[PDB]
UniProtKB/Swiss-Prot annotation, chain B:
Residues that hold bortezomib according to the record: A49
Compartments where located: Cytoplasm; Nucleus
UniProt record similarity statement: Belongs to the peptidase T1B family.
Entry superkingdom: Eukaryota
Predominant cellular place of this UniProt entry's protein: cytoplasm
Misc. comment: The side chain of Thr-1 acts as a nucleophile, and the N-terminal amino group acts as a proton acceptor. Present with 8530 molecules/cell in log phase SD medium.
Protein name as annotated: Proteasome subunit beta type-5
Reaction equation(s) it catalyzes: Cleavage of peptide bonds with very broad specificity
Keyword Transcription regulation: no
EC number(s) on file: 3.4.25.1
Class of enzymatic activity (EC top level): hydrolase
Encoding gene, per UniProt annotation: PRE2
UniProtKB/Swiss-Prot annotation, chain E:
Description of how the protein assembles with itself and partners: The 26S proteasome consists of a 20S proteasome core and two 19S regulatory subunits. The 20S proteasome core is composed of 28 subunits that are arranged in four stacked rings, resulting in a barrel-shaped structure. The two end rings are each formed by seven alpha subunits, and the two central rings are each formed by seven beta subunits. The catalytic chamber with the active sites is on the inside of the barrel.
Similarity comment: Belongs to the peptidase T1A family.
Keywords: Cytoplasm, Isopeptide bond, Nucleus, Phosphoprotein, Proteasome, Ubl conjugation
Residue(s) carrying Phosphoserine: S11
Protein name (record): Proteasome subunit alpha type-6
PROSITE patterns: PROTEASOME_ALPHA_1, PROTEASOME_ALPHA_2
Gene assigned in the entry: PRE5
Location(s) in or outside the cell: Cytoplasm; Nucleus
Database matches in Pfam families: Proteasome, Proteasome_A_N
InterPro entries registered for this protein in UniProt: Ntn_hydrolases_N (IPR029055), Proteasome_alpha (IPR050115), Proteasome_alpha-type (IPR023332), Proteasome_asu_N (IPR000426), Proteasome_sua/b (IPR001353)
Function text: The proteasome degrades poly-ubiquitinated proteins in the cytoplasm and in the nucleus. It is essential for the regulated turnover of proteins and for the removal of misfolded proteins. The proteasome is a multicatalytic proteinase complex that is characterized by its ability to cleave peptides with Arg, Phe, Tyr, Leu, and Glu adjacent to the leaving group at neutral or slightly basic pH. It has an ATP-dependent proteolytic activity.
Curated annotation (Swiss-Prot), chain F:
Record has Zinc-finger as a keyword: no
Gene name of this polypeptide: PUP1
Oligomer and partners: The 26S proteasome consists of a 20S proteasome core and two 19S regulatory subunits. The 20S proteasome core is composed of 28 subunits that are arranged in four stacked rings, resulting in a barrel-shaped structure. The two end rings are each formed by seven alpha subunits, and the two central rings are each formed by seven beta subunits. The catalytic chamber with the active sites is on the inside of the barrel.
KW Hydrolase (keyword) present: yes
Name of the featured protein: Proteasome subunit beta type-2
Swiss-Prot record, chain H:
Species assigned in the record: Saccharomyces cerevisiae (strain ATCC 204508 / S288c) (Baker's yeast)
A GO cellular-component term linked to this record: proteasome core complex, beta-subunit complex
One matching Pfam family: Proteasome
Protein name: Proteasome subunit beta type-7
Subunit structure: The 26S proteasome consists of a 20S proteasome core and two 19S regulatory subunits. The 20S proteasome core is composed of 28 subunits that are arranged in four stacked rings, resulting in a barrel-shaped structure. The two end rings are each formed by seven alpha subunits, and the two central rings are each formed by seven beta subunits. The catalytic chamber with the active sites is on the inside of the barrel. Interacts with CIC1.
UniProt-listed InterPro entries: Ntn_hydrolases_N, Proteasome_beta4, Proteasome_bsu_CS, Proteasome_sua/b, Proteasome_suB-type
Other remarks in the entry: Present with 16900 molecules/cell in log phase SD medium.
Subcellular location field: Cytoplasm; Nucleus
Family designation: Belongs to the peptidase T1B family.
Keyword Nucleus applies: yes
Entry keyword set: Cytoplasm, Nucleus, Proteasome
Length: 196, 212, 222, 249, 231, 226, 204, 232, 195
């Protein structure tokens, strides 16, 4: 399973596969790993499936209230919420979340949280378990500050490699684009990158 | 370790050895294992050093406190059945005990009780406790007499520990004697095993595994 | 997993004098084959003429020493600046040990000073409590090298007169504090050679009724 | 916080609890409500009233469903009715339905709601409820059955009864119109008609709420295909239906 | 009316009457005078026995090896606070390796007194403490009210007939601060000060109790033959 | 245990087997396996047999509460989010794997929920031991936009794949078809395969064949009074 | 070993037309040693019959548990509890102790007084209601019972055809099982009349 | 239980006459993958104390949280607590110690090793060590982790005891720490070229020099070696 | 473990318990009683796990006597057994069990009949005309089917019991140093000094 997020000039573009294997039998193959936790701050889930979803519901409860009392959260804020649930039940709740989002004041930001629960800011992130095959590809051909067209190909091309080398990554490539223009979903079916 | 007491018609001779260990080596040989609970009750330390030393001193808190409330010094039986109840809470918490509370009262005579880790409470009139309890029994039980003298009962005590000291690896050091009368315990001195061994052998013409 | 106790080595030797007390211990501080520090005490003054050393595993050593120096303070506060005996210090220490008996302390603790006869005492404890008044006793790693030697020279153990041939025991010796100090450094010089957990610095707290003296002397550093 | 742990329901010197009597006073201020138990149904009727005509009474419930067989109707305080309907629903499911797999008999649910009344005379810091409920229902063992729960905490089974501000007039009219045999169509014809000598505002189907616990419906059950289950015997009648039957008085 | 037996109720004149009544607990207590400089602070206390066979009541309480409190109110109430100060002094040493600051120790004190004046069944503490201590900011003298208000002063007094001591100090204010490195005189200026609160009570070797704190002296209480060289 | 839940254009159809097992032995040739949270929220359950029946009965309880406290229809999500939350606390010590299906005012739905609190959404999901087999048939015949008369056939042939090839599955095939703003129809015993032959003889016995040692009559009645 | 095979026990139950019958063995063992040939595993609350298999002590605990719950039902609602209503209470009591449960396997057998239908139901350890209108078998000779019972049984039997079938079904598994047998009691439950008939059978 | 997940490398350090040097590198390895680069492990605290943390990245972040609260805590009440009752190095130490012990007892440890490097208000040096066992000690040369037996030997060859701290100047110490990063960098398989460095002086304050690289490496010899022994 | 047989003849319950108590490697005491008088006509004998036995025998004797002084009417054997059954049930659900097997004999003065009862460590009450617990059980349940007859007198029953003991003495490889016999009958609770 491969999850990623990349920062670019107009904001941040998120990227996921859709295969969730358990064992040898693929339970679901159209999984939507890209979750809205506010309305301009979306996340990416990887790892132990029930334990990531449980946390996400609680983070959603935290941010819906945060909005209603104190004002709109930031990428920073949301990631922090996430960390402190993984950190304080860090023996039994096993979660890798990439919190990506578009602020109207600081633009796109990416945070990566691995399984211990430590935040780290990054200009693109990769976490998962199918992202150990594309580590060297993602760093060499990535550029900070790419225009829009470029970004969408960068994340496609990586996931295409992830699909190829990792059999726990597959199906549709889902991308959610977070920008000031708004919130736009793109979907790329297999022939469209298996062509390359 | 080897600790014993036996009633006879003068009261109770309590005798213990004074060497203890940890590992396969002599940690101490200065240790006294006869813990005064009261000045009318003697208790013995065998098994775990800490646990026996701690509780038997706490029993003497509850003995002292008994005297004040009822205006009357406690029975031997009442002392043992405080300790048994307490201990039994700490069962399956790793707590090892292995004590006898011995007292002379005027309404029970000499009495010995054995208390256990498990929380058994047994009465009886010869009780030998320790890793060397097998070797104390022998000599005690072959020359036990109820109708026995006070000179002779301290020497029967002396000798049950000196066999035990000899054959058991972990006993040794010194032998302690106590004659428990009605008016509290009298201490009947300290006999180093080093010095004691060869005097008993010269007197009785016993010991003849051991060169001489 | 987690493992919750270690060992930080070193050794102590408490010698109860006849009118003095001495409490010595090496100050070598180690973990595994590493030498953490050349010098870092294992003998602490607690004041009110009682010295204390807990040697074994360091982390317990620091905390149980610490919880003793408060039990000193609170005693002065609520019993109104009465003298705290060595004898009353001991009983007190036993509850501190025993308080944790299920996740227990890991240090052999030896105290020394002068009590209410003016005679040297050393009290040594086992890790889950129990204590005994001794004339000499060691604790720590290297303790079984130091002990059978000390028994030889102090208590004259197994030495008989010359020409008697065992019929008479060798007569006891009245000691002075310099006679003893000579003997402490030498027994430690041996242990340092022949064991790897001893060395560097030797720190000797002496208690006399005139105050508590601290005398440092070096060992070999290896 | 709390620092009250003593009752404020107390006996008077000539006997009788003062507080349970006062609470019963607040009930006879309220609306007029009636229940008539027939041989094939129970019909209940109450009158709906609002702050203003700009207030709707179609989004307010003065008849509630507790279980699919046992309904409620009140005279007394609106607020007290609200909480006491919800706590009954919660205890109907939790103290019998889970365990016994079916919904409670009418008697058995009545008995349970009577202890809630009791703990608001008893226990510190609380005052009694200020509603008298009729709890009409149907169970398999008492047939159709009518009870009247009061703030006292006691219940009495009835044949037909009235509570509210018109209670004394109502029951004198009900004495002469209860018959041994009453059909469900006849029962509705007495209950609207009684309530009409206790109305002085508007009389329309939008101001008169009527609910039958008649006989069963396999059309409000929501499914078909299990013949064990027979749907709600409770069936609240919309404003229009009630209105046809007002023109047929 | 019932505003006076309820600690939770105001008072149309904008007070609470209970804290006020509690402030009168200090007036019926005994007198004490504190004066401090930049290197040494001093408490000079008048103990007061009941009758001829009775002992004299200690009025300087050792809080630490560098901190002391003295009561002037009611004794039973002072025993709750004395522990509290000790508890937060050992916690500050234990955790943060810090000999608990005098000024911060006042601020803890406030909130213990406040939380029972906010709460019913509670009461303000009737005692009012003068708290000396020597930290890295130098010597300090705090006056603690039953109100929970703490104030920092060159020298003050509380007790009975306290106003006359405040006067002796208001005059002699600019003498003792410029005394530094001479505890002998600092002790002497407070003996004269508490002598203005007497009314034929005199000062003997059983009446006078002085305790000092230094930059070169710990906490010490003098009494008996040790205050007999300062009569 | 083969349980399909197939979404279609106007609704959802969920069908299951009638076999309940206890170990390798077939407890019951026919038993219900489709249960009813709410009249518009059906569910079938796979995994551990007791913990299917009770967890349905229990979130069943709280939704019925909740639907009447809100004076509105109980939504598919309402059920889903309580199930989910409840199962996570015991950290996957309660063995249930439910296909949850239903219609509500805000459309047709179909969910699956694992014993911890993963939830997935397709337009066709299956859980059980039959899951594998069921799923195969669906992916060949299935398309987007199926009619009712289409849907039911797809559901039936899907469970029959389950019966032939899985051994935890057998006997009759139950269906429940739900369409939006029409009554939910329970067609228990829709399609019966494996109809039991006539036994070769009767194994009835004349009177008196077995031996009695003693007899008595024992009373189930209350005490009477003459 | 097995916590439900350490004293054995079996219960068989069958329906007929207008009648039910239930039956248990009378064996209480402690492992290999037989202690008793006269311990019941069937009890009766009213006209409902609850046969309980599995671990020795939980048969007895559970009998006094439902004794408590049946009293409060009858007192409030002023009738004897029906078979169908009771089955739901047997399920919930097991499930309350979901972890570390009662290591039993009861059988509910009655004839409803409100509809006149034979009605039977079963339970495992945790308790899943097992509908039938055939028969339900439970215990430690239950593998044998499931085969044996099905083979003789013809759908619907007369009240005293039913005594010959359920008696043979019980005998033949019980003498091919080691922890079952050793004297047995068979009940025939008609509308209003229950007869308790002990059986002559192999004691060895 | 808690066992390491993401782990740093080593923080290394020594005393000199007028202050202390302490340096650490910027690494969070997640075992085999060296996954976080440019995530700093030295945390300056106060204005004269740098607290260099090794071990867990997760845990470390949450102990930076408590240090920041502690500056907020000491500032409160008192305006003279930022001048003469500031957070001393022995203070920052004492709280970190006490936290470790208490977490060790509940058997969920905060898995870190810390050096608390500073200079007192008195002008004394302070370099003191704590780890996750709860063990404390001071030395003239100190190092966490792997560096406690790699880097520590080289550093300890400049200052051997407590009478060569006066004789070791700011320029010999600077060199030794540079050198020891490079010695680690060869023979330690979790390391990064980038490292942060603090220098604590008792007259120029704390200087926080970031983003040094290791240079002057040896590799020139490696064209000579061929095979393992049989191949030449 | 230790011997523990009951045998209920038509006018008396005859219980017997072993003398020897072996805790450690060595018999420490050779005459200890393993019974407690609950009520004047109700007797409870015990053997089981060392040190649970003392606490569970004395606990139940406090509660039964309390109930007896209350109503001044002692509870039936039937009742005693059930209360006994109840605690052992509770103790295996609890954190650490009492594993103490007991034989309860009593004369019921209300049926005017002697009655015997067996309650195992799990808590199963059973009426039985003779019973046994532990390994002791294995050699005497078969020997007792041979000679027992329901209508026996007490002195017949004592020689049967000395037959039972004799069989144990050889075939058991564990010493018990003979039994102590105690009879429970309607004239009180008596002892026999013959083995």
């Amino acid at each position: 399973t491969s999850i990623m997020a990349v920062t670019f000039k107009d904001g941040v573009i998120l990227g996921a596969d859709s295969r969730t294997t358990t064992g040898a039998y693929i339970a679901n193959r159209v999984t939507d790993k890209l979750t809205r936790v506010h309305d301009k701050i979306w996340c990416c889930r990887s790892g132990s499936a029930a334990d990531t979803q449980a946390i996400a519901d609680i983070v959603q409860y935290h941010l819906e209230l945060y909005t209603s009392q104190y004002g709109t959260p930031s990428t920073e804020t949301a990631a922090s919420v996430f960390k402190e649930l993984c950190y304080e039940n860090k023996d039994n709740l096993t979660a890798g979340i990439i919190v990506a989002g578009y602020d109207d004041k600081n633009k796109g930001e990416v945070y990566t949280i691995p399984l211990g629960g430590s935040v780290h800011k990054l200009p693109y992130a990769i976490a998962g378990s199918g992202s150990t095959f594309i580590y060297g590809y993602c760093d060499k051909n990535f550029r900070e500050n790419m225009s829009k067209e470029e970004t969408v190909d960068f994340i496609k091309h990586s996931l295409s490699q992830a699909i190829k080398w990792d059999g726990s990554s597959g199906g549709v490539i889902r991308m959610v684009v977070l920008t000031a223009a708004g919130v736009e979903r793109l979907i790329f079916y297999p022939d469209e990158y298996e062509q390359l | 370790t080897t600790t014993l007491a036996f009633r006879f018609q003068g009261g109770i001779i309590v005798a213990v050895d004074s060497r203890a260990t940890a590992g396969n080596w002599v940690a101490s040989q200065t240790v006294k294992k006869v813990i005064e609970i009261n000045p009318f009750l003697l208790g013995t330390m065998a098994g775990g050093a800490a646990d026996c030393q701690f509780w038997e001193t706490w029993l003497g808190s509850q003995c002292r406190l008994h005297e004040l409330r009822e205006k009357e010094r406690i029975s031997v039986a009442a002392a043992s059945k405080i300790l048994s109840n307490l201990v039994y809470q700490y069962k399956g918490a790793g707590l090892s005990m292995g004590t006898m509370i011995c007292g002379y009262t005027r309404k029970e005579g000499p009495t010995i009780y054995y208390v256990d880790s498990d929380g058994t409470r047994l009465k009886g009139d010869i009780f030998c406790v320790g890793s060397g309890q097998t070797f104390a029994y022998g000599v005690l039980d072959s020359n036990y007499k109820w109708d026995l003298s006070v000179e002779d009962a301290l020497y029967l005590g002396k000798r049950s520990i000196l066999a035990a000291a000899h054959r058991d690896a972990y006993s040794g050091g010194s032998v302690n004697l106590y004659h428990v009368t009605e008016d509290g315990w009298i201490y009947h001195g300290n006999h180093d095993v080093g010095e004691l061994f060869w005097k008993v052998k010269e007197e009785e013409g016993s010991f003849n595994n051991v060169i001489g | 997993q987690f493992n919750p106790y270690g060992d930080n080595g070193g050794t102590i030797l408490g010698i109860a004098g006849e009118d003095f007390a001495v409490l010595a211990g090496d100050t070598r501080n180690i973990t595994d084959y590493s030498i953490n520090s050349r010098y870092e005490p294992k003998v602490f003054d607690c004041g009110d003429n009682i010295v204390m050393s807990a040697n074994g595993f360091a982390a317990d050593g620091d905390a149980l020493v610490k919880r003793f120096k408060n039990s000193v303070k609170w005693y002065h506060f609520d019993h109104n600046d009465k003298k705290l005996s060595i004898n009353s210090a001991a009983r007190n220490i036993q509850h501190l040990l025993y308080g944790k008996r299920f996740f227990p302390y890991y240090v052999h603790t030896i105290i020394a000073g002068l009590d209410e006869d003016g005679k040297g005492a050393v009290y040594s404890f086992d890790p889950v409590g129990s204590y005994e008044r001794e004339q000499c006793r060691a604790g720590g790693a290297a303790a079984s090298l130091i002990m059978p030697f000390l028994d030889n020279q102090v208590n004259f153990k197994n030495q008989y007169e010359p020409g008697t041939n065992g019929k008479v025991k060798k007569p006891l010796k009245y000691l002075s504090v310099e006679e003893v100090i000579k003997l402490v450094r030498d027994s430690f010089t041996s242990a340092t050679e022949r064991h790897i957990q001893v060395g560097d610095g030797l720190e000797i707290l002496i208690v006399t009724k005139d105050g508590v003296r601290k005398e440092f002397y070096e060992l070999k550093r290896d | 916080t709390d620092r009250y742990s003593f009752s404020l329901t107390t006996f008077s010197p000539s006997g009788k609890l003062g507080q349970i009597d006062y609470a019963l006073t607040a009930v006879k201020q309220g609306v007029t409500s009636l229940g008539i138990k027939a041989t094939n149904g129970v019909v209940i009727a109450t009158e709906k009233k609002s702050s203003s005509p700009l207030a709707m009474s179609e989004t307010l419930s003065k008849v509630s469903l507790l279980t699919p067989d046992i309904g409620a109707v009140y005279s007394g305080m609106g607020p007290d009715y609200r909480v006491l309907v919800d706590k009954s629903r919660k205890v109907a499911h939790t103290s019998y339905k889970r365990i016994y797999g079916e919904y409670p008999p009418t008697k058995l649910l009545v008995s349970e709601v009577a202890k809630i009344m009791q703990e608001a005379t008893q226990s510190g810091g609380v005052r009694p409820f200020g509603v008298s409920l009729l709890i009409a229902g149907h169970d398999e063992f008492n047939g159709f059955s009518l009870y009247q729960v009061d703030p006292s905490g006691s219940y009495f089974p009835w044949k037909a009864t009235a509570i509210g501000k018109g209670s004394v007039a109502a029951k004198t009219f009900l004495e002469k119109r209860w018959n041994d045999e009453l059909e469900l169509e006849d029962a509705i014809h007495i209950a609207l008609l009684t309530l009409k000598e206790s109305v002085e505002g508007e009389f329309n189907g939008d101001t008169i709420e009527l609910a039958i616990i008649g006989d069963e419906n396999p059309d409000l059950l929501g499914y078909t295909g299990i013949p064990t289950d027979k749907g709600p015997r409770f069936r609240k009648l919309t404003s229009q239906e009630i209105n046809d039957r007002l023109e047929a008085l | 009316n019932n505003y006076d037996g309820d600690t939770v109720t105001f008072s149309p004149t904008g007070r609470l009457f209970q804290v006020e009544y509690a402030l009168e607990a200090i007036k019926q207590g005994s007198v004490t005078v504190g004066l401090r400089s930049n290197t040494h602070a001093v408490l000079v206390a008048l103990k007061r026995n009941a009758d001829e066979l009775s002992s004299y009541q200690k009025k300087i309480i050792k809080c630490d090896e560098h901190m002391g409190l003295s009561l002037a109110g009611l004794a039973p109430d002072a025993r709750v606070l004395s522990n509290y100060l000790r508890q937060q002094c050992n916690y500050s040493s234990l955790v943060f390796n810090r000999k608990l600051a005098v000024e911060r120790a006042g601020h803890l004190l406030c909130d213990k007194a406040q939380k029972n004046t906010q709460s019913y069944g509670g009461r303000p503490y009737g005692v009012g403490l003068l708290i000396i201590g020597y930290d890295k900011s130098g010597a300090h003298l705090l006056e603690f009210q039953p109100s929970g208000n703490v104030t920092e002063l060159y020298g003050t007094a509380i007790g009975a007939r306290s106003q006359g001591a405040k006067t002796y100090l208001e005059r002699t204010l600019d003498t003792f601060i410029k005394i530094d490195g001479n505890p002998d005189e600092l002790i002497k200026a407070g003996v004269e000060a508490i002598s203005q609160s007497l009314r034929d009570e005199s000062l003997t070797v059983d009446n006078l109790s002085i305790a000092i704190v230094g930059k070169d002296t710990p906490f010490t209480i003098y009494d008996g033959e040790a205050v007999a060289k300062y009569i | 245990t083969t349980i399909v839940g197939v979404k279609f254009n106007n609704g959802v159809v969920i069908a299951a087997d009638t076999r309940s097992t206890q170990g390798p032995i077939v407890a019951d040739k026919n038993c219900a396996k489709l249960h009813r949270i709410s009249p518009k929220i059906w569910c079938a359950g796979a995994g551990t047999a007791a913990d299917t029946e009770a967890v349905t009965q229990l979130i069943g309880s709280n939704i019925e509460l909740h639907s009447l406290y809100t004076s509105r229809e109980p939504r598919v999500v309402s059920a889903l989010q309580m199930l989910k939350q409840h199962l996570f606390k015991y950290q996957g010590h309660i063995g249930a794997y439910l296909i949850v299906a239903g219609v509500d005012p805000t459309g047709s739905h179909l969910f699956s929920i694992h014993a911890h609190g993963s939830t997935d959404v397709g337009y066709y999901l299956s859980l059980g031991s039959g899951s594998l087999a069921a799923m195969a048939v669906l992916e060949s015949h299935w398309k987007q936009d199926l009619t009712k008369e289409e849907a039911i056939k797809l559901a039936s042939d899907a469970i029959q794949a389950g019966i032939w090839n899985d051994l935890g599955s057998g006997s009759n095939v139950d269906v429940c078809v739900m369409e939006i703003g029409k009554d939910a129809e329970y067609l228990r015993n829709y399609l019966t395969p494996n109809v039991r032959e006539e036994k070769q003889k009767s194994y009835k016995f004349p009177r008196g064949t077995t031996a009695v040692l003693k007899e008595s009559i024992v009373n189930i009645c209350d005490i009477q009074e003459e | 070993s097995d916590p439900s095979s350490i004293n054995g026990g079996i219960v068989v139950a069958m329906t007929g037309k207008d009648c039910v019958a239930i039956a248990c063995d009378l064996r209480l063992g402690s492992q290999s040693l037989g202690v008793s040939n006269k311990f019941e595993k069937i009890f009766h609350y009213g006209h409902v019959f609850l046969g309980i298999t599995g671990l020795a002590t939980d048969v007895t605990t559970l009998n006094e548990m439902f004794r408590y719950k049946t009293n409060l039902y009858k007192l409030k609602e002023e009738r004897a509890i029906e078979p169908e209503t009771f089955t739901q209470l047997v399920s919930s009591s097991l499930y309350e102790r979901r972890f570390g449960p009662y290591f039993v396997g009861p059988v509910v057998a009655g004839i409803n007084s409100k509809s006149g239908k034979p009605f039977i139901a079963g339970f495992d350890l945790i308790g899943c209601i097992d509908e039938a209108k055939d028969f339900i078998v439970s215990g430690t000779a239950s593998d044998q019972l499931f085969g044996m019972c099905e083979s003789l049984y013809e759908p619907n039997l007369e009240p005293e055809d039913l005594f010959e079938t359920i008696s043979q079904a019980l005998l033949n598994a019980a003498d091919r099982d080691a922890l079952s047998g050793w004297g047995a009691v068979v009940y025939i439950i008609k509308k209003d009349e229950v007869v308790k008939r002990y059986l002559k059978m192999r004691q060895d | 239980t808690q066992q390491p997940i993401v782990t740093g490398t080593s923080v290394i350090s020594m005393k000199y006459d007028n202050g202390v040097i302490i340096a650490a590198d910027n690494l969070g390895s997640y075992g085999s993958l060296l996954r976080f680069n440019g995530v700093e492990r030295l945390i300056p605290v106060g204005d004269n104390t740098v607290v260099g943390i090794s071990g867990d990245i997760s845990d470390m972040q949450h102990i930076e949280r408590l240090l920041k609260d502690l500056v907020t805590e000491n500032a409160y009440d008192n305006p003279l607590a930022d001048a003469e009752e500031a957070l001393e190095p022995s203070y920052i130490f004492e709280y970190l110690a006490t936290v470790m012990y208490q977490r060790r007892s509940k058997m969920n440890p905060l898995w870190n090793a810390i050096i608390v490097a500073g200079v007192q208000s008195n002008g004394d040096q302070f370099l003191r060590y704590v780890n996750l066992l709860g063990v404390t000690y001071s030395s003239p040369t100190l190092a966490t982790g792997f560096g406690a037996h790699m880097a520590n030997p080289l550093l300890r060859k400049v200052v051997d005891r407590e009478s060569d701290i006066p004789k070791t100047t700011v320029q010999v110490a600077e060199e030794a720490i540079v050198n020891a990063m490079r010695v680690l960098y060869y023979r330690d398989a979790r390391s990064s070229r980038n490292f942060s460095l603090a220098i604590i002086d008792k007259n120029t304050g704390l200087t926080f020099k970031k983003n040094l690289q290791v240079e002057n490496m040896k590799w020139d010899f490696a064209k000579d070696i061929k095979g393992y022994g049989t191949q030449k | 473990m230790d011997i523990i047989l009951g045998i209920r003849v038509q006018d008396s319950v005859i219980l017997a318990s072993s003398k020897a108590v072996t805790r450690g490697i060595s018999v420490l005491k050779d005459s200890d009683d393993k019974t407690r008088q609950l009520s004047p006509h109700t007797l409870m004998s015990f053997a089981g796990e060392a040190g649970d036995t003392v606490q569970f025998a004395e606990y139940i004797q406090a509660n039964i006597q309390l109930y007896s002084i209350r109503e001044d009417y002692e509870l039936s054997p039937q009742a005693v057994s059930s209360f006994v059954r109840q605690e052992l049930a509770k103790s295996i659900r609890s954190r650490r069990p009492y594993q103490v097997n007991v034989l309860i004999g009593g004369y019921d003065k209300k049926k005017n009949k002697p009655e015997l009862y067996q309650i195992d460590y799990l808590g199963t009450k059973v009426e039985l005309p003779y019973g046994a617990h532990g390994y002791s059980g294995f050699y005497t349940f078969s020997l007792l089917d041979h000679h027992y007859r329901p209508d026996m007198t007490t002195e017949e029953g004592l020689d049967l019991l000395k037959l039972c003991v004799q069989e144990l003495e050889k075939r058991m490889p564990m010493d018990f140093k003979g039994v102590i016999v105690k009879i429970v009958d309607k004239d009180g609770i008596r002892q026999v000094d013959d083995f």
